Structure 1
Amino acid sequence: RERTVRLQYGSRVEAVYVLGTYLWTDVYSAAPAGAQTFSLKHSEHVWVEVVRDGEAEEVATNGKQRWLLSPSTTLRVTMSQASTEASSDKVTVNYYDEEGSIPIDQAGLFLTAIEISLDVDADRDGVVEKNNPKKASWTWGPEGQGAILLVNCDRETPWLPKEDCRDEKVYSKEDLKDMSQMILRTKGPDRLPAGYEIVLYISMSDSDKVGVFYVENPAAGQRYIHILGRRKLYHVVKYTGGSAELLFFVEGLCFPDEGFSGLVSIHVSLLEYMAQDIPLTPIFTDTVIFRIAPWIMTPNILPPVSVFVCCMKDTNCELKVCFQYLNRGDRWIQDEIEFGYIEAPHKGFPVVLDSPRDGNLKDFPVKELLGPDFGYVTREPLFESVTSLDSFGNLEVSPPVTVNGKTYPLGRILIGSSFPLSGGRRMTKVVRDFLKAQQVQAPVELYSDWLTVGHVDEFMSFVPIPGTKKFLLLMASTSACYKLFREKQKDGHGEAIMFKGLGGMSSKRITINKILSNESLVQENLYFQRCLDWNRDILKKELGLTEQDIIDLPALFKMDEDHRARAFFPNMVNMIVLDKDLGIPKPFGPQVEEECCLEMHVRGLLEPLGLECTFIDDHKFLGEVHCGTNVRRKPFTFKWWHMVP
């Protein structure tokens, strides 16, 4: 960082030297007309080199030595340490005419050495290191370095219906715990030389991205000032003498999205005062880079924490019930809500994603899932209309996977869609852009649009098989149901009847025979099986799965007027997964040996593994038990900043 300084004719120039920089000094222009030579004298803590076209001769404090004047011959001035006083560090050059040994005129430089560094934590250990070279850049990888910033999606004070990032005001003292520290460190004399001031500033573009607070009068009357943020581009810092540190707290307002990479910057600058109606000059500038931590989903293979359910009709973790007024006739806590988390070094908390769907429970998250160490976010489309695929039963995430040499440690977000040439339903562009812009989990689009509801959770699920790993992707199969039913028919059970209890029940008698003897049905389910196999191909491709990794659960579908599938009997891939111990819907299949053959079948599949199956009663609404419940999960041990997406 080389800065240009020129002496003035017959005059003494006062200047501020910022450590970490070197001065190129021009002694030629200040030379009087007729002077053929120059000698120089300088202070102890000032290093002076005489540079003629690249060759630098370091010179003593008292020169008593002359050089030939020339534009090529110049000075290089460096300073080792900060100044105790505004002066006493100087470089004085005397000029000589060839006819005498006495100087004619002389020029000088009065140096005031200060050290200004804007510091953040770029090595991600949870404390702030002094002047990290990499602080102005952001690098992915375990050996990579950069500062990380959390959004405040949460609420310290219940008195308001908003996240803490929503205002420019800070109320509670615990707020700052979520903010990332930025310290301005300074070394210099008792005060600054006249016409100099230090200023913090951010872009107009970064106004809504960040905010920066300073805490004044700690204990006592303690107050939180908003120095940077919305409507504040700059703040003028008060300089304090000697070694001094100014502690600031930074908060991300916005999440990484379309048009926003997640990267933000804050600058500090030393401004020299020129004159009225003229801009201050940025003598020196230091810069730090924050990256706003993304939003990360939790798959079904992670340890569960909380289980949520709407209300109602009628193990080793808690259950949060959504009652009455909160329900407002909306039975789906799955579709409206996706659980996630955000993390920084030694900082982080759960964050919830609220669906644009805006069911009668739309009011519920904020009022409230939202509170201390619990986050909230939304994307509401303006020009686009909401469909059934924007429900979060259509939003899932895969276990950590490896696809052809590339690692996906946090898994891959799976969302349902339609063929591009179909012209069918799709998730809103805002949500897709959001998830895509999170970019750590690298979203994929399956095909859910052959289903009436259009959700991913209908045809697939993941369960842990406590190696602990490998997660055994479970898919629906109509083929398996027809196979099982044909086997039971050949066993003499073809007259056995589905839907014991309920209705008809046996008044309308639906038997394995009459089901297998249904033509339109078997055609429909052949087509549906194709629809399943396409998704199977996508999953195997993009998730790097073999055929060894898949289990086909018996399922049956029925085609509606839209040529879409609705569950013939309750969908069993619609289950919920807690640490093995499956929540599978009760299929209500036909009875063999006084037992439902479907239950015994899926047991015969999963039970040889650690999985313990449990069957829940529900289906005309229509959805099974995924649509009725949502489970909060414990995050990955893997830190997202160690990736290379």
Structure 2
Amino acid sequence: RERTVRLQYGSRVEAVYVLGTYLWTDVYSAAPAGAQTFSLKHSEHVWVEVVRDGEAEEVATNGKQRWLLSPSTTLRVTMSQASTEASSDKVTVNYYDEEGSIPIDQAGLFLTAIEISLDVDADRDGVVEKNNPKKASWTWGPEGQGAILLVNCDRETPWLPKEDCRDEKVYSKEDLKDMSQMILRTKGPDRLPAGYEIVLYISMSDSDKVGVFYVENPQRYIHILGRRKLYHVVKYTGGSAELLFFVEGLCFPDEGFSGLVSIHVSLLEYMAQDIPLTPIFTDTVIFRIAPWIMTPNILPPVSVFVCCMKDNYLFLKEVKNLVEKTNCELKVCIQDEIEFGYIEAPHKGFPVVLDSPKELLGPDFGYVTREPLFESVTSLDSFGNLEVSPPVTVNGKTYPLGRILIGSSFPLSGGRRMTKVVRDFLKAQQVQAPVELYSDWLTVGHVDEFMSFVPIPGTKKFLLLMASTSACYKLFREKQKDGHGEAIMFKGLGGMSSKRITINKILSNESLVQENLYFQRCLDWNRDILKKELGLTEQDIIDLPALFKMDEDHRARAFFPNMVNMIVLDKDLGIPKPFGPQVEEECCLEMHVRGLLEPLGLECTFIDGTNVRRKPFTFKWWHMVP
């Protein structure tokens, strides 16, 4: 900051100087008519150069020198420490004519130096450092810098019908732990010279994205900037001072919101009561609002939310028994209305649930929805149609939080699609760079019908499980050749089950073969996208046998329990029970799925839906580089 302050003909000029800046001071134009030259005195804690065509030259407090008056002779004026005294520091210029050695006129400059700094934790260690030089920018990576702000989308006080950030009020001191600290630090005399004040302010635009709070009697919580509050005039305390504000995020990154917000402080000069003139100093901090992040299946489970809204014991017992052999909780009352994720800042973080188009909205449990407006919901809006990969590297790039996957239709198909308003939210989060797959070939239309990830438990590595109809046909032709043709299929369930569906019955159904050829085609289309977009190879993929029937819409609905659609609890796999053609003790499908999976570390339990909240990534999203 080089800033202009001219001397004024015949006058003394009072100026505030902010430490960190430079004054350039015209002396020429204040000079009386007929002067040819000037000297100057200045005070101890004011540094003063003279400057002609770029050539600097320090000058003594005391010296008696005279120079030639000229528009290209100017001063540069700096100060090193704040004033304890309103003025005291000063620069005084004497002007002189051809003859005499007494000055003909003089002009002066009376400085009050102050320090003003609006400070944030741009280096991201949870401590509000002093005037971080990067605090007005935001960069990615471990070298990156720039403060981080959470959306205050949880709830501290449960009598509130909505989340914290929905009001312009802080009710509990609990709340402030979710907030980001911003410190106005000042250093100067017992007061400001007359005509100055300090204003914090925000833009109209940012006014619905931030809320700023002052804690009085640090007690009451003063809402100073935010909705319908674009500025706030700050009472200066003299001496070395610090004001503490707490900042809450209100809106997630989204369509038309990068997630970056600014807050400013200005030293504003006034002419009277009212009559604002111009700022003489401005300081600015940047915040990025933390994205919502989804949790893939490789990440350790913390709790498993079931909800059979009926009378289940054996679904409750095989899901309870599985959960027990893990660290984690059960949590009864699902997969289609709710997606678990989190938000993190260096100070703080907590789980947030995306709610599909309220209920778990608690302390340290946050909440977002996105609401269509014109576009109608379909089946593809259900969060069974929303999954996320493990960490992957795709051709050099790294995706340390994985990628979101959403089922879709082809763009010129007229098919179903998840609402744009949810699609836009998810891409706007950036850090899980979403991928559209093709799920609309399915009656229901969900990615979780045909793929799943499982961690290989020694690693540190995962596998893509894919449904495969061709795998199924290969298996049946073996069984039937093994003499199990007349072995009956799907004897178990108590609605639509088996009127002697045998393998033979199936294998000789030519119509159903062709449908399943079309479906294998839909599957291979997805396989090619997943391989490309998660940088996978055939090494990384296991095809689980699967069979569909083609409904009236030309869409697949499962023939028997889709086994890829499982609960992944670390090493325990909760895998739907197929009920299929036997050979002895157990099923030849169950034994086949046990065949592929168990030799890798994976411990399959077959269950006759759920949802699992998981540990965050250790990996900090700000260290990424999207």
Please state which band the TM-score falls in when normalised by the shorter chain. over 0.9
* Aligned equivalents of 1:546, 1:571: Cα separation in 2: 23
Q: What secondary structure does 2:152 align onto?
A: coil
| Structure 2, unaligned runs of 5 or more | 312-325
Percent same amino acid among aligned pairs?
Answer: 100
Cα shift at 1:105: 1.0
Deviations 1:212-249 (CA, angstroms, capped at 9, x unpaired): 0010012xxx1000011101000000000111000000
Cα shift at 1:346: 2.5
Cα shift at 1:47: 0.6
Whether the aligned pair in 1 keeps the contact of 2:390 and 2:401 (CA below 8 Å) is: yes
Q: Which residue of 2 aligns with 1:426?
A: 417
Deviations 1:566-617 (CA, angstroms, capped at 9, x unpaired): 010011111110011100000011222142111000000101111111111x
Match 1:595 to one of 586, 594, 606: 586
Deviations 1:422-471 (CA, angstroms, capped at 9, x unpaired): 11000100000000000000000000000000000000000111132221
- Aligned length, in residue pairs: 610
* Aligned equivalents of 1:588, 1:126: Cα separation in 2: 55
Q: What secondary structure does 1:488 align onto?
A: helix
Deviations 1:466-506 (CA, angstroms, capped at 9, x unpaired): 13222110000111111111100000111101122336899
Q: What secondary structure does 2:5 align onto?
A: strand
Q: How does 1:535-574 map to 2 (within 5 A)?
A: 535-574=526-565
TM value normalised by structure 2 = 0.96
1:187 aligns with 2:184: no
Deviations 1:353-382 (CA, angstroms, capped at 9, x unpaired): 0001xxxxxxxxxxx211000010000011
Q: What secondary structure does 1:613 align onto?
A: strand
Residue 37 and residue 509 in structure 1: after superposition, are their counterparts in 2 closer, same or farther (change >3 A)?
same
* Aligned equivalents of 1:170, 1:313: Cα separation in 2: 40
Deviates more, 1:549-558 or 1:593-602: 593-602
Deviations 1:126-175 (CA, angstroms, capped at 9, x unpaired): 10100100000000111111100000110001102111000000001110
Residue 276 and residue 197 in structure 1: after superposition, are their counterparts in 2 closer, same or farther (change >3 A)?
closer
* Aligned equivalents of 1:507, 1:25: Cα separation in 2: 96
1:237 aligns with 2:228: no
Deviations 1:68-92 (CA, angstroms, capped at 9, x unpaired): 1111111111100000100110000
Residue 268 and residue 504 in structure 1: after superposition, are their counterparts in 2 closer, same or farther (change >3 A)?
closer
Q: Which residue of 2 aligns with 1:399?
A: 390
* Aligned equivalents of 2:534, 2:89: Cα separation in 1: 65
Q: How does 1:44-123 map to 2 (within 5 A)?
A: 44-123=44-123
Q: Which residue of 2 aligns with 1:630?
A: 611
Deviates more, 1:493-502 or 1:528-537: 493-502
Whether the aligned pair in 2 keeps the contact of 1:93 and 1:108 (CA below 8 Å) is: yes
Deviations 1:11-49 (CA, angstroms, capped at 9, x unpaired): 100000001001000111111101111110000000111
Residue 460 and residue 506 in structure 1: after superposition, are their counterparts in 2 closer, same or farther (change >3 A)?
closer
Whether the aligned pair in 2 keeps the contact of 1:499 and 1:505 (CA below 8 Å) is: no
* Aligned equivalents of 2:46, 2:496: Cα separation in 1: 99
Q: How does 1:507-518 map to 2 (within 5 A)?
A: 508-518=499-509
Residue 391 and residue 246 in structure 1: after superposition, are their counterparts in 2 closer, same or farther (change >3 A)?
same
Whether the aligned pair in 2 keeps the contact of 1:116 and 1:187 (CA below 8 Å) is: yes
Residue 194 and residue 507 in structure 1: after superposition, are their counterparts in 2 closer, same or farther (change >3 A)?
closer
Whether the aligned pair in 2 keeps the contact of 1:261 and 1:437 (CA below 8 Å) is: yes
Q: Pairwise CA RMSD of aligned residues?
A: 1.1
Whether the aligned pair in 2 keeps the contact of 1:415 and 1:456 (CA below 8 Å) is: yes
* Aligned equivalents of 1:507, 1:548: Cα separation in 2: 36
* Aligned equivalents of 1:634, 1:503: Cα separation in 2: 38
Deviations 1:507-550 (CA, angstroms, capped at 9, x unpaired): 71110001101011111111111111000000001100000000
Deviates more, 1:589-598 or 1:295-304: 589-598
Residue 95 and residue 313 in structure 1: after superposition, are their counterparts in 2 closer, same or farther (change >3 A)?
same
Q: Which residue of 1 aligns with 2:318?
A: none
Q: How does 1:154-553 map to 2 (within 5 A)?
A: 154-218=154-218, 222-275=219-272, 278-314=275-311, 315-322=326-333, 333-356=334-357, 368-502=359-493, 508-553=499-544
Q: What secondary structure does 2:518 align onto?
A: helix
Deviations 1:52-80 (CA, angstroms, capped at 9, x unpaired): 11111100002211111111111111100
Whether the aligned pair in 2 keeps the contact of 1:436 and 1:442 (CA below 8 Å) is: yes
Residue 50 and residue 501 in structure 1: after superposition, are their counterparts in 2 closer, same or farther (change >3 A)?
closer
TM value normalised by structure 1 = 0.93
* Aligned equivalents of 1:157, 1:591: Cα separation in 2: 57
Q: Which residue of 2 aligns with 1:364?
A: none
* Aligned equivalents of 2:496, 2:270: Cα separation in 1: 90
Whether the aligned pair in 2 keeps the contact of 1:274 and 1:281 (CA below 8 Å) is: no
Cα shift at 1:275: 4.0
Q: What secondary structure does 1:582 align onto?
A: strand
Q: What secondary structure does 1:190 align onto?
A: coil
Cα shift at 1:99: 1.4
Whether the aligned pair in 1 keeps the contact of 2:491 and 2:498 (CA below 8 Å) is: no
Residue 179 and residue 274 in structure 1: after superposition, are their counterparts in 2 closer, same or farther (change >3 A)?
same
Whether the aligned pair in 2 keeps the contact of 1:500 and 1:590 (CA below 8 Å) is: no
Whether the aligned pair in 1 keeps the contact of 2:458 and 2:601 (CA below 8 Å) is: no
Whether the aligned pair in 1 keeps the contact of 2:195 and 2:272 (CA below 8 Å) is: no
Residue 610 and residue 8 in structure 1: after superposition, are their counterparts in 2 closer, same or farther (change >3 A)?
same
Cα shift at 1:312: 3.7
* Aligned equivalents of 1:342, 1:441: Cα separation in 2: 13
* Aligned equivalents of 1:302, 1:610: Cα separation in 2: 16
Deviates more, 1:372-381 or 1:273-282: 273-282
Cα shift at 1:274: 2.3
Q: What secondary structure does 1:280 align onto?
A: strand
| Structure 1, unaligned runs of 5 or more | 323-332, 357-367, 617-627
Residue 507 and residue 142 in structure 1: after superposition, are their counterparts in 2 closer, same or farther (change >3 A)?
closer
Q: What secondary structure does 1:476 align onto?
A: strand
Q: What secondary structure does 2:574 align onto?
A: coil
Whether the aligned pair in 1 keeps the contact of 2:296 and 2:387 (CA below 8 Å) is: yes
Q: What secondary structure does 1:376 align onto?
A: strand
* Aligned equivalents of 1:549, 1:212: Cα separation in 2: 49
Whether the aligned pair in 1 keeps the contact of 2:489 and 2:498 (CA below 8 Å) is: no
* Aligned equivalents of 2:540, 2:480: Cα separation in 1: 30
Q: What secondary structure does 1:614 align onto?
A: strand
Deviations 1:199-222 (CA, angstroms, capped at 9, x unpaired): 10000000110010010012xxx1
